[PDB]
């Protein structure tokens, strides 16, 4: 029936089954890294009232309460069996008695834990402008909840969205991408960043009508999923400035050369987007994350540090050059060094193991790898 496992400072019971998609209550251990990062981040932004929209086993919210400054943690899931496993796992990491009720339970101890058996769109809708932080971790696309989450979070709240929607976001299913994200995807060596930027840009677009803009705290790709942490800005002016960060991409698949164009609409044919052409991180914050992550007991510390450091030293410039792909048409360390000697900025990128982000033009990049 149930197996007791441990993640971070959390001890939970998960159903034992053939695969993760076969257990009555979902739990993907590979997502431990995803939860480490949000924990590291929360230990910086220090949100007071947080929400684990689609909790499943309750692991995320449970780690929120045990490993972060969060004072009021809300756990929610539409599934009855999940709700029951959530209540159990909560009482497995916290003391006192759970004052349960019809599909709703509460625990008022050092931290306040609100466990809910409800539909996320229903809960969030009841909780208008209530959370400092909301974490959306759905099966694939978050579009079904995005709009309601933008109304449930404080006008200055933080929104965490994950998208395991690789197929549409990476160009495999262009028509599916158009329906869910209202953007024309780009496949190929760049689809990892473009997919991430499409994600940020759709949040930016949905937030604008509430006269809200965004600041990307951190956005990255990893293990086939897209993560986006954004800070909401109050004001039509902020909203307008956000939409101004949107743009389109032009890509020559024969050469690997790409071009960017800032604007709500493109002005040339064969445009990819719209996508977020703004920053993909808040360097000041990401740097602290590396420091914080080192002083925390995460579930996958080594990988968490390895990923955070990569992003920390990474250039925040749109797109990059994949040495392997272009090669088809030397070592990355050597190319980077040769680029820096000439005075250009160049760094590795978490998007690709052979990718290089640089301020050098396509042409110079090609000349340099040839020398
Ligand atoms: N409308 C809805 N409201 C609340 N939960 C929903 C929902 N639609 C689907 N779900 C569900 O979302 C799941 C996503 S799996 C989620 C995992 C996670 N947060 C972690 O770190 O483990 C299931 O438990 C489930 O029943």
Curated annotation (Swiss-Prot):
Family: Belongs to the class I-like SAM-binding methyltransferase superfamily. Trm1 family.
SUPFAM superfamilies with a match to the protein in the record: S-adenosyl-L-methionine-dependent methyltransferases
EC number(s) stated in the UniProt entry for this protein: 2.1.1.216
Example GO BP: tRNA N2-guanine methylation
Role: Dimethylates a single guanine residue at position 26 of a number of tRNAs using S-adenosyl-L-methionine as donor of the methyl groups.
InterPro entries: SAM-dependent_MTases_sf, Trm1, TRM1_arc_bac, tRNA_met_Trm1_C
Name the record gives this protein: tRNA (guanine(26)-N(2))-dimethyltransferase
Organism: Pyrococcus horikoshii (strain ATCC 700860 / DSM 12428 / JCM 9974 / NBRC 100139 / OT-3)
One GO MF term attached to the UniProt entry: tRNA binding
All residue ranges annotated as the Trm1 methyltransferase domain in the record: 3-369
Keyword entries, A-Z: Methyltransferase, RNA-binding, S-adenosyl-L-methionine, Transferase, tRNA processing, tRNA-binding
Residues binding S-adenosyl-L-methionine: 35, 60, 77, 119-120
Reactions accelerated catalytically: guanosine(26) in tRNA + 2 S-adenosyl-L-methionine = N(2)-dimethylguanosine(26) in tRNA + 2 S-adenosyl-L-homocysteine + 2 H(+)
Primary enzyme class: transferase
Gene3D superfamilies: N2,N2-dimethylguanosine tRNA methyltransferase, C-terminal domain, Vaccinia Virus protein VP39
């Amino acid at each position: 029936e149930l197996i007791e496992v441990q993640e971070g400072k959390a001890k939970i019971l998960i159903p034992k089954a053939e695969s993760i998609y076969d257990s009555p209550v979902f739990y993907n251990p590979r997502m431990a890294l995803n939860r480490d990062i949000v924990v590291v981040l929360l230990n910086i932004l220090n949100p007071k009232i947080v929400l684990d929209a689609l909790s499943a086993t309750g692991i995320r919210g449970i780690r929120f309460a045990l490993e972060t400054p969060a004072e009021e943690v809300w756990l929610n899931d539409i599934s009855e069996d999940a709700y029951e496993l959530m209540k159990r796992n909560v009482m497995l990491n916290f003391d006192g008695e759970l004052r349960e009720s019809k599909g709703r339970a509460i625990l008022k101890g050092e931290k306040t834990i609100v466990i809910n058996h409800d539909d996320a769109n229903r809960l969030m809708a009841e909780r208008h402008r209530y959370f400092h932080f909301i974490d959306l971790d759905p099966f694939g696309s978050p579009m079904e909840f995005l709009d309601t989450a933008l109304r449930s979070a404080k006008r200055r709240g933080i929104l965490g969205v994950t998208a395991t929607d690789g197929a549409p976001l990476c160009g495999a299913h262009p028509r599916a991408c158009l329906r869910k994200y209202l953007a024309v995807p780009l496949r190929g060596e760049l689809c990892h960043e473009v997919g991430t930027r499409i994600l940020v840009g759709v949040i930016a677009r949905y937030a604008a009508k509430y006269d809200l803009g965004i600041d990307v705290i951190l956005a990255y790709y990893k293990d086939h999923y897209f993560r986006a942490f954004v800070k909401l800005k109050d004001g039509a002016r902020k909203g307008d400035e956000t939409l101004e960060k949107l743009g389109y991409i032009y890509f020559d698949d024969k050469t690997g050369k790409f071009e960017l164009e800032q604007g709500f609409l493109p002005t040339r044919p064969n445009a990819y987007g719209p996508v977020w052409l703004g920053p993909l991180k808040d360097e000041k914050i990401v740097s602290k994350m590396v420091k914080e992550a080192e002083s925390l007991s995460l579930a996958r510390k080594k990988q968490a540090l390895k990923l955070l450091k990569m992003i920390d030293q990474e250039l925040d410039i749109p797109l990059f050059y994949d040495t392997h792909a272009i090669g088809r048409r030397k070592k990355v360390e050597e190319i980077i060094s040769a680029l820096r000697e000439q005075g250009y900025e160049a760094t590795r990128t978490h998007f690709s193991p052979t990718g290089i982000k640089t301020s050098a033009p396509y042409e110079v990049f090609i000349e340099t790898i040839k020398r």
